[PDB]
Structures are given as structure tokens and as C-alpha cells.
Amino acid sequence: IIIATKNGKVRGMQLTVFGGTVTAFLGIPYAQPPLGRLRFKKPQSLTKWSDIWNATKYANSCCQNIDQSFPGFHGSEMWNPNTDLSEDCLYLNVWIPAPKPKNATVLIWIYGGGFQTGTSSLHVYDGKFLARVERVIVVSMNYRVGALGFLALPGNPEAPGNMGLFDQQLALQWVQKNIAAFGGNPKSVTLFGESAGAASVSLHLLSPGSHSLFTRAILQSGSFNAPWAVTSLYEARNRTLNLAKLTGCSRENETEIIKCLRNKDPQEILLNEAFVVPYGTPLSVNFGPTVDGDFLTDMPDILLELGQFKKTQILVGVNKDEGTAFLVYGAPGFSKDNNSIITRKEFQEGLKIFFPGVSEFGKESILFHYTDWVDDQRPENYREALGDVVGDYNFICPALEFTKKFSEWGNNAFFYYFEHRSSKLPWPEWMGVMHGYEIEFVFGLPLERRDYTKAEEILSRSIVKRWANFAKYGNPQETQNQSTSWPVFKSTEQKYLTLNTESTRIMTKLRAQQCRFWTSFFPKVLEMTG
Amino acid sequence: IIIATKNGKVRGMQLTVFGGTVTAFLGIPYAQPPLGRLRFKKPQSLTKWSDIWNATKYANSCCQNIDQSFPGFHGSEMWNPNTDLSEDCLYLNVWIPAPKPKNATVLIWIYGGGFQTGTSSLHVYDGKFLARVERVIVVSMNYRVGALGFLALPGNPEAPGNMGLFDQQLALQWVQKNIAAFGGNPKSVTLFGESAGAASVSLHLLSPGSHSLFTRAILQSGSFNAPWAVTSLYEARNRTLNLAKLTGCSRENETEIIKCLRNKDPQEILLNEAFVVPYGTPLSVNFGPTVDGDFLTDMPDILLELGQFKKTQILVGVNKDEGTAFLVYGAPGFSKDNNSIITRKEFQEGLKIFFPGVSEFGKESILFHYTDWVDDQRPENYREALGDVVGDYNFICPALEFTKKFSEWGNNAFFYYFEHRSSKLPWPEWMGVMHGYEIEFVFGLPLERRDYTKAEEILSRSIVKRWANFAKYGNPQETQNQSTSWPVFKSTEQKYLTLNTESTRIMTKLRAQQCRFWTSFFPKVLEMTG
Amino acid sequence: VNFGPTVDGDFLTDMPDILLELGQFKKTQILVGVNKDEGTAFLVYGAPGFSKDNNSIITRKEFQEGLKIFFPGVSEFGKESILFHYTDWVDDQRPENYREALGDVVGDYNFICPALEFTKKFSEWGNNAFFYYFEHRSSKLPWPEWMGVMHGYEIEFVFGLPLERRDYTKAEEILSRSIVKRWANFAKYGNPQETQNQSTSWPVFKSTEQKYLTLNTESTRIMTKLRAQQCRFWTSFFPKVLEMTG
């Protein structure tokens, strides 16, 4: 089937889904391929073409180091890119319900991967199920990542930082100009992303540029105010230089460092990236977003406090076990291959892995708030506690704190705490309800009968409906199959719905005790040293 | 007199009314005659004409089976079409006050007849009285009905469903483009309809298409949420196919079934219509509205709950005896020709007629809530109770429930309970204040002195004034002839005005006990079986 | 309860449900609460397939056999509705399904829902009311694991028996201590907080919101609308099926 866009005609394909039809346009270019001179620059606009683009393959993932800790292990490879890596990677997918609606609501997916990795083309981001089941147009884009997407040399026009964010933004502009031709409704666009894809979404709530480019926003396990999310102006300078040194790019004429790196291979850049930071963590974001003065026009960490953002409804949530995923990538005593029971000495071995540049009081205080058990019996004591440290600290408390500061200014916020564990989950039980493992449900994967427990097909169906109802109508309610209605998260009561296969309840003040610590006591201990 | 419309000049006539003058344009085409290829398709736009249309006859009623249960009986023939049946029937009438106003408020009539029947041209829908008495422009249209108006083959472009609704919609667009030429005010249009004409109006409150095509809405004895009102996507599929089989239209190439039926006679279609459903009821709506994804963009039954509809004032009401009308068309023991006293065995004989696909608990529960009398004396016990079952269930509870869920979202809702019985009524006393017998009063029929009790001339004059004041000003008050003012129906108190010839009172919570049953206990009993 | 309280005209002057409906009761504070598994204790004393000596993993038919036991004079359709509400299995998996179904049927109907209804009707007249959900299995419990947090077995803790450093785990001695402090505080001060050992404060059960406090060795949350679905069934729907029954 053919569709006429502002750049030229495009040819898509017709997938068979649930005894009916969806129409897919995979890998549509939306920007000029950021090659050679353009590398590091903001995405340039795209020249028209008088033929037809064959939007029938998935396109290239952007350049990134691939995870190699567990080769052949699905648990980690289901996250690895499944298309040729290439600097020529600025493409987007569109999935339309059949028959062409009408004036359809648009869902836009922004993938995560701590700004270092990710790709639109993953199987768990397959938009076909959503389009067909809920008659929505789903859209996802590739945007640059790592130094190629986030190299900052402050103010300097040929290395401004936030390139990857601009990529998302331009893709959003594409949908604003072109989606009507597809039957979609530019005045209803919900942005949705996960982890660093959620920090991204949250940043678009701040970005004067993005402001008129979407209606609403969904924020799965991530927000700009999370500790990993935003690079300071001068951490970024330091990093860009350290790279220059690691590759033989040191100079004086500052533009030349950028002429220097423009001429290296993606690979001389890639291998060195991991080494530009003094001491790492498994969550180290070497090239993420910076306050660039163009995209972000001022520290986000302030715009929030003073109410400067798009005022609209938001859906935000986290997972029961955000922190476990990380423990197998640095923390002594941990292996995906046994019950990972750990010793107190090892817990502290662990604390230095996750908080390397922190005081002795910092750690001993973390230690104290997390390790006074009612019955110091359960051999899993420490193992569970290192996970909650990593979780609460980097994901839960930031997310809840974001939802507070934002809903403070009059808008509707709904919050979820997702806590069912996939029957299919390739990691072991101790790891629980890991980071990034609700995406399957959101994208409606357990809907595909030929796979999942029947319970999970109910659970995906709910989340799917709830999501679409939020996109369409600004309300993540599921009205038919007798549910319990989802209360709006206000600053006093602080209500959030729990998601699982066997009892959704309304609960208040998630992580009360633990966010206090992370939100006031701990940062105070940090003021004392550094 | 001549008027220039966007399609061409039109010639109307001048009726003599109440010692003054009204100007009438009967049977104006507003769509392309849905013939041959167009049958089943949405109404096509209409080519200009350079002569003059002679809008001086009533036009054709659309094809429908006529009621033949009581030939010669006025009570049923006053409802039967009074113009040649024809597939060429998309016409509208306009009645203008003389002399040509000005910037007049517009009332639009949508006739009922459980989507199977009806016609604009009935004597009880004569708009001349209203136009003259209240200086309003009245407008009514013919729209397709039965399978010809509501054949659904989901998404399939040449049999989309809701054709008859689109007919109404296009007629509404006509008024938006043309009414100013007549002296009417497109920024004040009240929609008003009865029964299935009220379900229609309620559907236009949901329909993105209709949204900017009227100001306000009046809903007499009907709403989409009534049990008869809306066909499920797959009841509709099943029905369309069963028809195909009943006529020798079975196929595989699905479009061909539609090419097949396109080539049959209205009559091979008509006689079979009654037979496409497994078991009937006297209220069976074989081809009604469906969730089509184009007109209705999602289950209405949800759009309501989530507040997605035109936010405006509404007038809604029912009649003291909505249910009696139906009892003479299936229910054992019932005849318009004696006091129809019935036995308990027969009451249950009756319950299976009106609830055929329901459990044994379903019926025995209905039985229980309706048949515990204070004094099981009155021989009319069961007779009255089968009427209220049919009434409360299909008309009263749905209507009240609609008024709740809608007014929940901030708009003004007024509710009436009309309860005077026409002195002229051709059916017998036991039947009481039947379904569809307030229309006479609304259209101002007892105003025509030469006929009705003087009391009824007062009663019509009130309702007439109240209606116009709602259309013009959004307030169904009657300020002069010392009335009692009509309170707004809010969700707490739930006030409604009673209409009759000898005491209008403000009362609360109509049918409290009975709607509880129909609204929670009963549907719960239904969850247990099916 | 073959020989119990009646309206004698002397101790109870009128029907208790009336007195409660119309607010004829001593206006004061109360502390109410129930145990996670009230019902189970009674399934060993009559219900087919139940023993304190095994798995007790029962089949559908012994579920219905069991219903006949606990609802002797309840209509054909009456029982069937209790069946539908509690056997709503998303996945037909757990071999332990109907076992817990029956547990809950007996608990919700005889203990939890009447307790909850009680607190509402009482709070409605504007006295403080405190509701708890005791959800901790004593390690000492002689009864089998499946019987859970049984009827009667919160008393050990209220009377301070886990305080005896000679027996109970150390956590049970913490939980017992709090409960003991909460209990004494309430009695002294009409307010069952544990203000020291940094508790989570225990809010009033207001007629609207329906807050309650969970009591355990572990996750001590404040929660809302306990057994909300189950008690709608027992509160309004089931009493409307009894009105047909006879």
C-alpha cells in the first residue's frame, strides 16, 4: 500500500494479526543520514525524493557496544540490537490499524538503554499488537546514542550535546506533519518510553521545542530527575576531553577536537567510551543528556521546581524489582546461575561498586537503613537489600518524586506499581520483577495465544486497554471487565494502583520509609563530604 | 416562495395556521438517492441543479415492513408510513415561521421506530404548529432503516453499518450550510427525537462527526444505553451472514455477499430481516447501530463512562406506561380488546417472550422483585407488572442511568416524567400513558382547537413553550402562566418534573427500587450464566 | 451456636441491628479486627476432604459437599452464587484452589464481613474506630501450614506470651510487644499508636475512606477497603438471594 508524505511516496506491507490486518511502514527515513561532517551535529532536514521509499524492512540500529556478559542467553540478547549497526540509522516505524482509520490516536515509543544502547526494532516493541487490538497508530523511532548521540562541547555549534534528543524531536515533528496522511490525529499524541526512554519523555515535558508536539506522556521506570539521567555541563566537558585524549584527539583549537573525532571510526570512539569516566558503575551513563541551553534551556532540576513544563496528564510507574537486573554486572557474589546468597562483607563489597565516589558515612548510613531485619534469618537478607538499594535509589524514589513535584502544579498524574513476574522470564526467580519486564505486557505480547499463562493474557489485555484509554481520553481506566478504577495521584494521599495477575489494589505512599532516606537524610550526609 | 440553496433554488408552499401563516418546504433532497450500487454505502453528496426543486409534496418514506397486527386500527396505523415506500427516500422537510425571520432557533426532529421503521411525514410530527406558535424553524429528515440503513460488515467500505445515522448526520450538515438562507440560526440547533430517534440523538452526542452540528439535545423515551439500542460488532456479523444465507447470498469473497445483496429486491431483503435473529422479542432490533469505528469511534457504553461527549444541556424524559405498547405484540393473555387480566402462569409465559436468552434465575428473580403485592387482590396485578418490567427495563432505567452518567460531567440535565393520557387515545385504558404518546403534545396537536379537552390545550401549550425555551435559551422553563420552575437534575438529589393536566410537581429519584434491581442485582444474576 | 444471645427485653432492649442502625449504643472509641484465615479452623470439623493430618487439597465436588455443610438451609441458586463468586479462577492451575475458596467463604461470611459492616455502622455516628488485619502465622502453630493465620491465634500475641524469652522467634517477640503497647495505649488513651519504636501511625477508620492497619512480623502497611468485593457479595447481593430462598 502507498502513502504520500511531505518528502515523497512510501510503500508499506500488510501483516497478519489476530485473524485481521495491520499495515506496517518499517524504517522510514526522517532525517538526513548523520554521516561524516554531520556526525555530532543536530539532525539535518531531509530532501524530497520523487520515487517511492520501500518501508518494508526494519532499518539500521545506531552504533553501540553490544552486551557480551552472557552470550547466547536470551535474558540479555532479547535486549541486543537485531539489525546491522550503522551511523546511518535515523529511521522510524509506523503501524496503522486496518482499515485505514479515520482520525486515530497516536502512540509514540521511545526505547531505553541508559542512552548508550537500544533500537526500535526489538520484538518486545512490536507495535502491531497495539494497533490491531486498540485501533491506534503506534510509532517508534531510532535516535543516536552514546557519544555519537550525546557528545557535549558546551555551546560549540558542531558538538552541542542532546543530539539524540533532537533526533526524537525531529521524529516527533515528522509525525506532526505526516501522520494525518496515515489516518492518525496529530492533536492526540501520547509519548511513551521506558527507563532512559522515560527520562527522554520527561525531558520533552520540559523542552520548549517539543512542547506543541504531543498531548500526553507515559513514563515507565525512568525520569530526568533520576541520578543517572542528566550529565552536568562540566562532567560533560571533562568526558569529551578524556575521550579526545583516549583517541589521540587532544588539541587547543577546540573545533579541531571535533574535526579530529569527526574523522575517527565509530569503533575507535566506541571502545574508548567506556573509559572516559574516572570510576564506573553498572549504571554509568557516560554520554547522556546535558543542560545544553538549546533543547533544555536551563537546569531541568529547576524547571521542575518552578512549574515550567507542558501541563498535561501523565502516567508513571515502576516495577517491584528494578534493582536486581544490575547486580549481575559488577556486584560480587551475584550470578544469574544460582540463588546468589550473599554475605554482609559482600553487601559492602557491593555498596562500593554502586556508590564509588561517596563517603564512608554515606555507605554505612545506606547500610544502616537497609539492614535492620526483624529476623536476621533468611539467608537472602543482604541479597534482597542490595537490590532494593539499587532500585529505590535509581528508579523508585526518583519516579515518585517526579510525580509529586509535577502534580503539585494542578495536572492529573496516575501512578502504577507493576509486580507480576513473567512465566517466560529467562532470569532466575531471586531477580523477581526486573527492570524493563513490563514492556512485554504493555506491547501486548501475551495476547499472542501461541506462546504465556491465560492469567497473563488477562493482565496484558488490561494494561493494553488502560494504556490506550489514557492515550485516547486521558484516563487509564478499564471500564468493562469489572476493574477497580485508578485514582489520580495527589500530593497528600499519594495513591497508586498495583498491577499483577491476581489482585489489583489501591495503595498509598509507595516506599515511604525508603524515599525519605534517599530524598532527605542521605543527600544531607552527602552535603557533609563533597 | 423561492429560496437559494448551495445546490439550487427551491420552491415551497404557504400553509394556513392559527389565523396566520407558516412556510413549508416538504421533501427537499439532501443526499444522492441511494440506488443500485449506492445501496448500503454511506450517503453520497448531491450534484447541483440549475432549475427549481418543487418542495411541495411530502417525499417517499424509506423501505420497511409495515405493521399488520391491527389493520384499520388507528392506534397502530397512525404510526404506519403515509407515503410511497422507496429506496429513494433521503429527503427533508423545513417549516419556517412567517414572515421570514431574522435569526431563528432551529429544532431538528429525528423519528423513532426501533430503527426498523418510521417516516418524517407523519401527522404527529407536523412541524407547522411549532413554527407558528413559537417562531422556530422546525426540520425533520428521512434516513434509511432496517438492513438497508444498518447492514454491518465490520470495516468493509461498502457495508460499514450506521448508514442511517450518517443519513441524519448529512441532513444535519445540510442545515448547517443552508438554514441561514431560510432565516434560521446554525449556532442554535436543538436535536430532538423519540425512542430510537432518541437513541439516535444520544449517539450524535458521542459522534465526533456530529459534534459541531448542533447546540443542544432532547431525548424522549430512548438513549443509546438502552438494551435494544446498540448491536455488538459480532451480533451484526452473524446477522448479516444469516441474511446472506436466507436470500441465497452465502459466499467466500466477502465483498461479493455485498454485491449479491446489492442485486436483490428490497423485498427479498425485507421479508427475511425478521428471520436473521435466533429468537425474537417484540423489541428485537435486527438491524440497528453498531460500533463502526467511523461514526461511533469506540464502544459508546465506554465513551459515556469516561466523559467523552459533546458537553451541553440536555432534556430527557419518559412516560408513565412505556411498556404496555409492546404487550399486544407477543405476550399471551393480552388483547387491545378487553381488560387483558392475566394469570401468574401467563406472566411467566410473558417473561420468556421478553427475556428468551436468559437464565431460570434471571426470570424467577425478575418475577420476585415485581410480584410481592401489599394486597394480592386487584385482578390486574400481573398485567400491570409485566408492563412495568418491559417499561423500566428497556426505557426508564436506561434513560435515568444515561442522565446520571452524563450530568456527572458538569452539564445541565433536566428530566421529565410525562403522565397524562390522551382523551383521544385509540388504545384501551389499561394500557395507560403509552410509549410515543407525548409526541402529540410536543408537536402542539391539541393546540388545533377543532379536535382535545381544554386541559390538554393548556398541557400542550406548556410543553411546547418549555421545549422552545430549552431550544432557544437552554432552559425548559415556562415563565408567564405561573408554573413551577424545572430543577436541574443533579446526581445526588435527582429531581424531575412530572407532566400532566392537573398537577406538575418536583419529585426525586424516579423508580428508585426498580432501577437498583435492573442496574445492579439483575445484571449480576446475568454474570452467573453467560 | 445452639444456645446464644437473644433479645430478651431486659439485657437487650430491642433488636441489636435496629439499635445499631439508629445509633443507640454507647458513644466511644473501639478497636476492631480480624485474622487472615478465620475460616480454616472450622473446615476440619465436618467438611469432606479436610484433615489436620494432610495436604487437604480438595476437588470441586467436595467443595459443593462442603457448602451443603456450612449453608444447610440455603436455596438451590443461593449456593450456586457463592460458588460463582469464590471460584473465579483466571488460571485453573493451583491444586490448592477449592481448599482456599472454602476457607475464605467461611471466613468472609462469618467473621470479616460482619466485622467490617459493624465498624462502618458504628463509625457513621462519629466515634473513632480502629480496624486491624492480623496476618502472621505463629511459628509454634500445632495446626498444619495450610490452615494459615487461624481464628484464635492472635490472642497468644495480645496477652504477651511471645514476650516469654523461654520458648517463639525474636520477631514474634517484637510484634507481640508492639501489639501489647498499642493495646494498652488504646485502653489508657483511646489511641492505639506505638509512638517509640518508629511505627507507622494507625489511622481512624472513617466511614468513607475505610483505612485499616496490617499486623505482621514484616510488611506493616496501612491499607484500604479490606475484602471489598467479597463483602459487597455478602452485604447486598447474597441477602437478596435469601429473600427468594424462602
Ligand SMILES: *[C@@H]1O[C@H](CO)[C@@H](O[C@@H]2O[C@H](CO)[C@@H](O)[C@H](O)[C@H]2NC(C)=O)[C@H](O)[C@H]1NC(C)=O
Ligand atoms: C553463585 O555463583 C557465584 C558466581 O559464580 C558465586 O560467587 C563466587 O564466590 C567465590 C568467592 O567469592 C568465587 O569463586 C567467585 O569469584 C565468586 N563470583 C564472583 C566473580 O564474584 C556464589 O558463591 C554462588 N552462590 C551460591 C552457591 O549460592
Ligand SMILES: *[C@@H]1O[C@H](CO)[C@@H](O[C@@H]2O[C@H](CO)[C@@H](O)[C@H](O)[C@H]2NC(C)=O)[C@H](O)[C@H]1NC(C)=O
Ligand atoms: C382478552 O382477549 C384475549 C385474546 O383474545 C384473551 O386471551 C386468550 O386466552 C385464551 C386461552 O389462553 C385463548 O382463547 C386465546 O388464544 C388467548 N389469546 C392469545 C392469542 O394469547 C383473554 O382471555 C381476554 N381477557 C379477558 C376477557 O379479560
Ligand SMILES: *[C@@H]1O[C@H](CO)[C@@H](O)[C@H](O)[C@H]1NC(C)=O
Ligand atoms: C521496492 O520494491 C518494489 C516491488 O514492488 C519496486 O517497485 C521498487 O523497485 C523498490 N523500490 C525502490 C526504492 O527502488
Ligand SMILES: *[C@@H]1O[C@H](CO)[C@@H](O)[C@H](O)[C@H]1NC(C)=O
Ligand atoms: C480529529 O480530531 C480533532 C480533535 O481531537 C479535530 O480537530 C480534527 O479536525 C480531526 N481530524 C479529522 C481528519 O477527523
Ligand SMILES: *[C@@H]1O[C@H](CO)[C@@H](O)[C@H](O)[C@H]1NC(C)=O
Ligand atoms: C473482559 O472480558 C473477558 C474476560 O471475561 C476478556 O476476554 C476480555 O478481553 C476482557 N476485556 C478487557 C478489555 O479486559
Ligand SMILES: *[C@@H]1O[C@H](CO)[C@@H](O)[C@H](O)[C@H]1NC(C)=O
Ligand atoms: C413545479 O411546479 C411549478 C408551478 O408553479 C412549475 O414552475 C415547475 O414546472 C415545477 N418544477 C419542476 C421541478 O419542473
Ligand SMILES: *[C@@H]1O[C@H](CO)[C@@H](O)[C@H](O)[C@H]1NC(C)=O
Ligand atoms: C445569529 O445569532 C448568533 C449568536 O447566537 C450570531 O453569531 C449570528 O451572527 C446571528 N446571525 C444573524 C444573521 O443574525
Ligand SMILES: *[C@@H]1O[C@H](CO)[C@@H](O)[C@H](O)[C@H]1NC(C)=O
Ligand atoms: C398562559 O395564559 C393563558 C391561560 O390563562 C393561556 O391562554 C396561555 O396560552 C398561557 N401561556 C402559556 C405559554 O402557557
